[PDB]
């Protein structure tokens, strides 16, 4: 029946790896804030990630968190910890100098090397011991091709207990220039989710910052209890 969701809906503990793009483009103070005016993409990201972690910890507590930055290659700050303080210690100390492009191969390799995926005798009824999910906040172009990944990476995505959520900050809807390339690169990220389901978000550099917070909130949902992205609506007060 077209697309099928086999996984049970149970509140398993989450291992959440949050990836931040550190580019010169992230130091742009063009995001409008609902209090005063202007704000930086990185400071909004710090407030957003701190709020996300503080909120997730108050729910069930058993959740585990990790922080990763992206430059020429992925880099691990603090991870697989149930105490959020560690993460905040590494979070409020970031530089955004961009001296190279961003490699997905390195990120997949580091994530695979730092944690293993689980398996169960029955994936349709037996709830897994934990669920692995990775959030990527990115803005720079991927340069389009970069080949079609490898067998181990496709197997990583093939796992029903592994989730990849993405937020892309782009000028495709602002400029409408090279809009073909912007939409094609978003679709390049949207052609990997087809391994089960996953959440994707798009934001303009005009903001306001609200649309980014309003975005991170939507990623709080537990991936096994979270409905399909296209079905999710929050304005339940008309």
């Amino acid at each position: 029946s077209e697309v099928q969701i086999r996984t049970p809906r149970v509140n398993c503990p989450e291992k959440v790896i949050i990836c931040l793009d550190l580019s010169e483009e992230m130091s742009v103070p063009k995001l409008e804030s609902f209090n005063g005016s202007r704000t930086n993409a990185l400071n909004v990201s710090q407030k957003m990630v701190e709020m996300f972690v503080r909120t997730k910890h108050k729910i069930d507590k058993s959740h585990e968190f990790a922080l990763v930055v992206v430059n020429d290659d992925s880099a691990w700050l603090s991870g697989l910890t149930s105490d959020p303080r560690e993460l905040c210690s590494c979070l409020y100390d970031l530089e955004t100098a961009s001296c190279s492009t961003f490699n997905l191969e390195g990120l997949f390799s580091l994530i695979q090397q730092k944690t293993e995926l689980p398996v169960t005798e029955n994936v349709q009824t037996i709830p897994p011991p934990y669920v692995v999910r990775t959030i990527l906040v990115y803005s720079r172009p991927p340069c389009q091709p970069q080949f079609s990944l490898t067998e181990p990476m496709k197997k990583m995505f093939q796992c029903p207990y592994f989730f990849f959520d993405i937020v892309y900050i782009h000028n495709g809807t602002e400029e409408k220039e090279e809009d073909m390339s912007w939409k094609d690169m978003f679709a390049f990220m949207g052609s990997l989710d087809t391994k089960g389901a996953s959440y994707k978000y798009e934001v303009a550099l005009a903001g306001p910052a609200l649309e980014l917070h309003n975005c991170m909130a939507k990623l709080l949902a537990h991936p096994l209890q979270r409905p399909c992205q296209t079905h999710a609506s929050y304005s339940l007060l008309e």
Partner: protein, 67 residues
């Protein structure tokens, strides 16, 4: 003889569907598990109406006390 014998050549959640269809069939087509990727409206379902099913069990405990 064994060679001649060898060459001779001698997926829905059925429990959920049957329990849903047996629980208050007054809802008619309400028994479903497929939706349009766009709008939140029901799509037709192929699980069929024909199976015996076993272990039909309590939906909610219908009791009320105080103290």
């Amino acid at each position: 003889r064994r060679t001649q014998q060898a060459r001779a050549t001698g997926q829905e959640n059925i429990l959920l569907c049957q329990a849903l269809r047996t629980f208050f069939p007054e809802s008619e087509v309400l028994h479903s598990c497929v939706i349009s990727l766009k709008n939140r409206h029901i799509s037709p379902s192929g699980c069929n109406v024909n199976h015996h099913v076993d272990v039909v069990d309590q939906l909610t405990l219908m009791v009320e006390y105080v103290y």
